[PDB]
Design a protein around this ligand. Sequence first.
Ligand code: HEM
Ligand code: HEM
Lengths: 362, 363
Amino acid sequence: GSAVPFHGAHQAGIATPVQDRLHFAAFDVTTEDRAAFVALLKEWTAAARRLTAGHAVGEGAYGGLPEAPPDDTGEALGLKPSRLTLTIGFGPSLFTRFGLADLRPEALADLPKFPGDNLDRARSGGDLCVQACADDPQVAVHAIRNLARIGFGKVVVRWSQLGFGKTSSTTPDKQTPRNLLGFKDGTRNIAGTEKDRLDRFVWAAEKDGTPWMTGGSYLVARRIRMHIETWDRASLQEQEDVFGRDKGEGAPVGKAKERDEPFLKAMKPDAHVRLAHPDSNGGATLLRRGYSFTDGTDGLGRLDAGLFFLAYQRDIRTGFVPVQRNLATDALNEYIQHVGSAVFAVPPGVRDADDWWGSTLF
Amino acid sequence: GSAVPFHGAHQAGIATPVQDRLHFAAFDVTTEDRAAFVALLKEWTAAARRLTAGHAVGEGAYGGLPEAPPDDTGEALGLKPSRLTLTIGFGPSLFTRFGLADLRPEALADLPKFPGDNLDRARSGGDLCVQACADDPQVAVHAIRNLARIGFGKVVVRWSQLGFGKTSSTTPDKQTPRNLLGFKDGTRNIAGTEKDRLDRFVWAAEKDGTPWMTGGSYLVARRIRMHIETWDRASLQEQEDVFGRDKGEGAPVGKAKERDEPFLKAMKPDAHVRLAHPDSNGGATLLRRGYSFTDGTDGLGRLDAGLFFLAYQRDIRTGFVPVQRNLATDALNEYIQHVGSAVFAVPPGVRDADDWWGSTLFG
Ligand code: HEM
Ligand code: HEM
């Protein structure tokens, strides 16, 4: 139930241990006034300091003037911080406004089309995002609701995604969670303690060519539907062959333990792990941080189910793009479909109490 | 606690402690064959015994024949029982099948149309329900996913709702939860400790007229959307006047503490608590066991959130119906809309290892 520190060289919610719940919102900007937008970033930063410490925003949730609406909507009263993190990003579309055109980073690349894509335009893109993660769903909803309320008239919610359970790990010392296909997901990631690998593969550097992004990262989001009817009639051997790991322990094929190193040549040539592994991709490595979802039924008698895939990396061109290209022949493609997509530049950390989200850009 | 016993005179998940998460599913039946349906109820009961004890269904999630599909889909491996309960109920539409029309209980009454209803037919009704409650949502989802798979060919999923209450790891057991309007919700309710009040207001008795339902209960489900953005623009005074309790402490107006008994005359005439109280409804009293929901945002950018309301009672005609009828002029109506509805007869408990869901009805 403890708090995660809000200030630092980097934003929290990336290398941080993965929390149980997600509420992700993408927003579009409705104001043309640069100064008004800056004022919103400052007000949102102030609110974030309160929320991540388990305090109400502004003057509180009750005990003000009877004839005014409360500053805080009140549904998190009496709850602990619950490891809430709030992570902001800026989409490519933002840079067509406020005179920002020449400051768009090269590393913030538009994704190509991928075979099998079926992207809903309404649940794709966005001028900016807020990733709220916490162990308590009510704490996460409260944060997004209050940020949206504060921004009324300057931003609107484009689309949102809730994740009921995590399917990722930045803590290899703890149990790896399972996705809705029944397999462990997160064994070979990047850990929060691996400072050298984070500098190499996740954090942007000054020399990369965009000074305001130093200490930030780049985010790819992919909404992925799972064909669970089709999966659930596959044999055990078919399921295991698709991944290259066994289902029970999650060990590489032939080996006894989850964390034994994969021997790729023992896997089928189209196995997911074999195609996705850094050694198959010129060393390309990602920080995966996704969550499972279910949004009701499909109207055809079945549960809906999916995975909201999130990856962080130092440059989209050298991270997600080469890996996803190599997945063109993946055995897993028979059972999944990508139906939503977005990319964001995740700025550096809020250094101290005088700093604000986006200060290096603006 | 870790696990809740599956067997008893009553089904678990009604009077047993309230768990942090919900997955509620309504099913429609596709077979006309009574024998095939009974076989399914037996298979489902066997699965439920395994799920509620934290075990995999059938021969397990791995380690069987490589060329066969696993019996269990595997996504709850390594998790705890998480206080899972599985509660089954039968809708009015089930009784048009299998020659059951004369065994429909009179207490399983069709609901009238209420003012302001805007019911989505696709998220209403159903032949059957399973209420899965647990502290971990993946445990609840796994249960529904595997029941649906076992039943494939005989039942389909009509509609499904996820919900959340408190998170028990971080929040004390005696603290009343708040709903998404920011008010404490559950202060004056029937508690599972109140054996006599359960006998008077919740459990069906033999003399009530339907012998197979003795020790069962009747369930009403309502999916109630809140107009979040409108509510959040209301003044503090307006919000408190809507309920008749204050927002910070949740005390009745003119009182100091949450659990102080209300004085109805100090509240506005159309305040929610005043209209819903038993003294305003001839003594009618309900067990509320509902969960908050947040599903996402709609096409206009608004939050799709609310209360998935669940009420158990001895008779729908003397529980939910009179109380909801009295809310015709509720001040809360400005901020909510009922968008889904269903009613179910929840049979008595599974007595022992040889019993099965629905045995008193089917024989
Ligand atoms: C529904 C979609 C997906 C499922 C169910 C899935 C499942 C898995 C599983 C079970 C593992 C093995 C355990 C582990 O090391 O984490 C794995 C590994 C991996 N996946 Fe996926 N995955 C999916 C989509 C993706 C996508 C879209 C990407 C990147 C474009 C990706 C990249 C990886 C990587 C990099 C690994 C680690 C390989 C290694 O270094 O050993 N996955 N995935
Ligand atoms: C979104 C919908 C609703 C909200 C936000 C809501 C909220 C509340 C709140 C805050 C209380 C006071 C604290 C407490 O005793 O629990 C309350 C009490 C109550 N509500 Fe509602 N409620 C809703 C719908 C309903 C419906 C549909 C019914 C019944 C048909 C109902 C029946 C009651 C009852 C019986 C009480 C207890 C009154 C007493 O004995 O003091 N509520 N509700």
